[PDB]
Amino acid sequence: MRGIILAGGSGTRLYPITMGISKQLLPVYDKPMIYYPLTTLMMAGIRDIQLITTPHDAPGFHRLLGDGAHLGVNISYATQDQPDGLAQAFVIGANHIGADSVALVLGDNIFYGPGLGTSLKRFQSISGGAIFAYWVANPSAYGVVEFGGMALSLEEKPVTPKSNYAVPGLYFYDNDVIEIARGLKKSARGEYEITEVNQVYLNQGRLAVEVLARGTAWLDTGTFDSLLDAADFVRTLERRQGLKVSIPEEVAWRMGWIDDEQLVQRARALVKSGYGNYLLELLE
Amino acid sequence: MRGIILAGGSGTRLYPITMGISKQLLPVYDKPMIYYPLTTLMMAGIRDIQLITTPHDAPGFHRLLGDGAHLGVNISYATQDQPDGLAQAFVIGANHIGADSVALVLGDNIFYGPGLGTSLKRFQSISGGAIFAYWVANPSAYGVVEFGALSLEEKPKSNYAVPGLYFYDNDVIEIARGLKKSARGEYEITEVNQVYLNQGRLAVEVLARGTAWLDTGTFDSLLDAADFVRTLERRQGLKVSIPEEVAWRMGWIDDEQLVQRARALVKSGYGNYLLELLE
Amino acid sequence: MRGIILAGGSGTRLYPITMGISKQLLPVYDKPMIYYPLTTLMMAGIRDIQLITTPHDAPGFHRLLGDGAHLGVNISYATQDQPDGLAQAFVIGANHIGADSVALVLGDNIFYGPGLGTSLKRFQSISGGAIFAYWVANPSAYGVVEFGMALSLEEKPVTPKSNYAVPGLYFYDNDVIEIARGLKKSARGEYEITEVNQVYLNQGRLAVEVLARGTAWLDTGTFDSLLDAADFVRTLERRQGLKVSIPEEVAWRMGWIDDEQLVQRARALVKSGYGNYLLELLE
Amino acid sequence: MRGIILAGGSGTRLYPITMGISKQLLPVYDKPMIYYPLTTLMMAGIRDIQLITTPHDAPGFHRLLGDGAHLGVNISYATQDQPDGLAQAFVIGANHIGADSVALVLGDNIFYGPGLGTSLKRFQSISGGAIFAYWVANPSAYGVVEFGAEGMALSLEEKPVTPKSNYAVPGLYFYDNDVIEIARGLKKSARGEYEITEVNQVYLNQGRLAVEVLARGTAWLDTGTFDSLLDAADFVRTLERRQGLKVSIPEEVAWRMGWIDDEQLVQRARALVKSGYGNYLLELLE
């Protein structure tokens, strides 16, 4: 299975913060935003990960991640000329995907909790599509899945939502998604829609939908309030429960993709922020 | 008076966040970090403002700020190739400063409260230097002033921090030049202040009771800053350091310009506050 | 002008917290809830303050506040046998008020900012009624005032005519007692403060002021609003070095207690940190 | 095994808050403080629970908890004349404990996370004593346990000026029946109190103190200062807002244990309608 992080977009909902910088390079407490979706792929067992970025923001990502060898992975890059839809991930990313299955994660999404770690490897064998559902108070802000207990309908940002279940930005597909995505026309709102990709899998009878487990947090960081709330959550997990979450150096180390020497290496550079100290303790 | 914002630095206390974004382009709730020291200069009535940035981050600043004209100011850019210390502000910015007095603000500082708004205009006339003091529990983390003004020491003989806002007459260009490095290895703003102190030409004001001064340079201090700004909006209905507001209140842009900035920033909710300013 | 704090009620919106203890004895960061409305009355210059409580919660209040002498005021008590509504403050409190004007503050309310400190003494000379207005995003939760000047007043409207809540601070001349005595129970089953205000509005004798820009107003009667309030107060201290609604400070600033008395208060409260602030006042 | 919650104390470190309310009746977000230690005992499988309070604070606890039957538990109420120390729990509570083992939990403590739920029942068979350890930045502020080279407990000190480790000893203790006589033999410490640390020292010196470092990802909190109380409330709200969990809900535990049935749970939900807390109970039934 190959991994893609959609990390472009104009970030208009964060202006003026994102006039000067990509949403995906914004801090969430103690690490760049892009670290969270990066680690979600890594935890699913994926080592070949492509970022799709705008042309103008790519150098930021290159400066931050290079080719990902320091994290035990192969990170590569592709460019999206304008932000004309999430379903373009599979078109732009088709070379990267090859003949494999794919996991797409959105660059502004944070997944945390039971079932959202190393157990995501269960999706590597995907046949058809697999997507998720997460109860929210305001479903009209998201893609929405309606159940009957199987999935019944999907709608992007419905003015009259048919459930309270948002569809988070993590999607697993077999290789058929490339042809599905290539065949899509632009929606009314001007975009190649991931919700329409999911519709085709649904029509065929091979969309699986799983409600995220009790105790899971899912966050989209695309508003001033949700970005700040995400940071507070991550800090709270460290201060109260002693956990640093989505630390790619740790995940790479726990998966065996880098050794102790390398871990120490990464830690030394990050000593002064406090981030590198966390890394050191993992050893002792 | 001309304005300089130091907005370079390596940001090593924020790694890895600052491996991919400048500290001065960090979000602090509803706006980027640079907006805070920028609006502090604008409130002092300063329209000639040079950002010193690193070569690599400069593009982000440009995309955000351009030439300033939309905020009714003249934003100019200079490069500092290496973060060799704060006093390089004056050497690097000397063509900018010219024959004028100068306000230097640090790119990662927030000033909020009594006496830190449009009353700052009074410093335009500065002769000598003028700096500030602010009580803090952890005086070691900052530069430090003792009163009888008595001693300055960069990182205690008191609990008074010297925050990152400094006003100098034209002499500072020469004084910065006539310096040579500290034990860690930087040209320190603290030494400039020492020089002015030595001639008996440094004024120091304790910031007013109830002022907030913040430095966003660590994971906790940044997040605490963000939280503070949001708290001001949710609890007190105040949006702070909005440059379009300051410019509009100063007469530097007009109603229809304001309405344009607002339309451009409508999706995030930031523009809606600018529209409310008219109603 | 005399003062009343309504500090009874059942606290159902905080159950099961308030199955133990009164809402008005809950912490907000560094002090009991009741200190905020108490200090409001004090900043208005009022020294004769009656607390109305339930019968069962009274001992908590007596333990905390006693007769108020340590704060340079006279705190007295009355009980409300059932929580039959806010306007009963003026019936229960009739003897306390006597012939005087009165300020009523609700026990779960925090007022902070410009115009909400010692400048409140300007209301002592009230003729008629004077109430306030504060923009909230969710007006249906509160008393609501519509402007055109005040056009209408409605208690928790399903379709609010404005975003302006009517906060729990009210100043009235002596006529309020008879107005309250004449009320019947609303559809809700309570003698409503909103109806008292309606009577003054009917008579053209209700003044309404929108709270100043930069003011905070809070009602702490939900889990979220209680916790939000605590976070706000701690933020003021951590970020701006302010401790707010400290009654010892207010009393000392009014001349009601002296330096040596302030020291005694500080000494009583030193293990928590609260007393250290009081010592820092002296310098 | 019997349970005791120590819920007295003067609460001086929270004055003036605790001049008007017991620390153990303070709000922690959506429930009183006392519900956390109570639910800890219940999750250990303990239904016979003694609450020790001050005499003046007792009525508030009775108003809250009544006879405990709504939670499927039996509540014995005791009072402590003066706050003379933690080990007095076993003297006051001697009749309550009888011949059984006992769990003691401190009224101002919150335990959350792996190993601190229903798996606590593993301590009912305790022989000797069993206590815990939790890394803190400021161990001076707590009882402190030092481990030897072989990883076993080596020393215990209450609030040492020079801590020998960073491991605080949290306020949850499991003991066999010998604890009563041990506690009976104690003299007041240099703080003037009958200390829990001295009880634990007796068992350690006897070679029968077991100490477990709390599992990775656990939260342990003491709510006895303005900042720790507020931090605790923030934590509990974040778990709901972000992870969709309400924690230490004793009605839920009683219902999961089979101590109350569906109709009883609804009855509790109905008493708790206006706050949101009851609505959570209704959601459990689905």
Ligand SMILES: Cc1cn([C@H]2C[C@H](O)[C@@H](COP(=O)(O)OP(=O)(O)O[C@H]3O[C@H](CO)[C@@H](O)[C@H](O)[C@H]3O)O2)c(=O)[nH]c1=O
């Ligand atoms: C439209 C577009 C977006 N992006 C990036 C930016 C974000 O990291 C990510 C998703 O864009 P956003 O504008 O944040 O999308 P958002 O409104 O949050 O909605 C999406 O994300 C939601 C979950 O966060 C889903 O429930 C929706 O079904 C899905 O459409 O993709 C691209 O890289 N290219 C694009 O063309």
Ligand SMILES: Cc1cn([C@H]2C[C@H](O)[C@@H](COP(=O)(O)OP(=O)(O)O[C@H]3O[C@H](CO)[C@@H](O)[C@H](O)[C@H]3O)O2)c(=O)[nH]c1=O
């Ligand atoms: C290993 C590791 C994990 N995490 C995060 C990822 C998740 O949000 C959270 C839990 O991840 P993991 O511990 O790998 O466990 P998870 O994927 O939930 O799998 C567990 O939970 C599943 C569902 O209960 C079980 O079926 C599995 O057997 C069990 O291993 O911790 C980090 O942030 N950093 C890490 O290094």
Ligand SMILES: Cc1cn([C@H]2C[C@H](O)[C@@H](COP(=O)(O)OP(=O)(O)O[C@H]3O[C@H](CO)[C@@H](O)[C@H](O)[C@H]3O)O2)c(=O)[nH]c1=O
């Ligand atoms: C060294 C250096 C820094 N910078 C930028 C980064 C920051 O915006 C600002 C100050 O750099 P920082 O490393 O944050 O400095 P910091 O440790 O906070 O200390 C300074 O700022 C403190 C106030 O925050 C003062 O109390 C100290 O006296 C002063 O030394 O200048 C530059 O643009 N160029 C530079 O060469």
Ligand SMILES: Cc1cn([C@H]2C[C@H](O)[C@@H](COP(=O)(O)OP(=O)(O)O[C@H]3O[C@H](CO)[C@@H](O)[C@H](O)[C@H]3O)O2)c(=O)[nH]c1=O
């Ligand atoms: C009904 C009743 C309440 N009380 C106490 C409890 C509270 O401290 C205070 C107010 O009662 P609460 O139930 O919070 O009222 P609440 O729903 O917030 O609304 C009141 O207060 C709101 C402002 O907080 C106003 O906007 C409303 O017009 C007013 O009716 O009075 C009494 O002492 N006796 C009572 O009969």
Ligand SMILES: Cc1cn([C@H]2C[C@H](O)[C@@H](COP(=O)(O)OP(=O)(O)O[C@H]3O[C@H](CO)[C@@H](O)[C@H](O)[C@H]3O)O2)c(=O)[nH]c1=O
């Ligand atoms: C002295 C005393 C206290 N209490 C109650 C109040 C609290 O809920 C609980 C503990 O008293 P506190 O004064 O908070 O104790 P505290 O300083 O936190 O320290 C205790 O609890 C700490 C854990 O929170 C331990 O690490 C210490 O070893 C232990 O002595 O017992 C009583 O019921 N009776 C008492 O005599």
Ligand SMILES: Cc1cn([C@H]2C[C@H](O)[C@@H](COP(=O)(O)OP(=O)(O)O)O2)c(=O)[nH]c1=O
């Ligand atoms: C005028 C103005 C002030 N402020 C801030 C600056 C100060 O921190 C605070 C008070 O400033 P100001 O009202 O200008 O007061 P002063 O006369 O004390 O200088 O409000 C803004 O954030 N935006 C604005 O448009």
Ligand SMILES: Cc1cn([C@H]2C[C@H](O)[C@@H](COP(=O)(O)OP(=O)(O)O)O2)c(=O)[nH]c1=O
């Ligand atoms: C004097 C004083 C005011 N305050 C609060 C009350 C108000 O919320 C705010 C300002 O009050 P104050 O300075 O008295 O101003 P005003 O003249 O505007 O009424 O500070 C305290 O908390 N403690 C005090 O001792």
Ligand SMILES: Cc1cn([C@H]2C[C@H](O)[C@@H](COP(=O)(O)OP(=O)(O)O)O2)c(=O)[nH]c1=O
């Ligand atoms: C069963 C249950 C557990 N919990 C809490 C207790 C613990 O802090 C955490 C885990 O408890 P539990 O799931 O019982 O697991 P363990 O087997 O690790 O003991 O969840 C509740 O808050 N409510 C509940 O109803």
Ligand SMILES: [Cl-]
């Ligand atoms: Cl109430």
Ligand SMILES: [Mg+2]
């Ligand atoms: Mg998004």
Ligand SMILES: [Mg+2]
């Ligand atoms: Mg700094």
Ligand SMILES: [Mg+2]
């Ligand atoms: Mg109320």
Ligand SMILES: [Mg+2]
């Ligand atoms: Mg018995």
Ligand SMILES: [Mg+2]
């Ligand atoms: Mg304690």
Ligand code: NA
């Ligand atoms: Na037994």
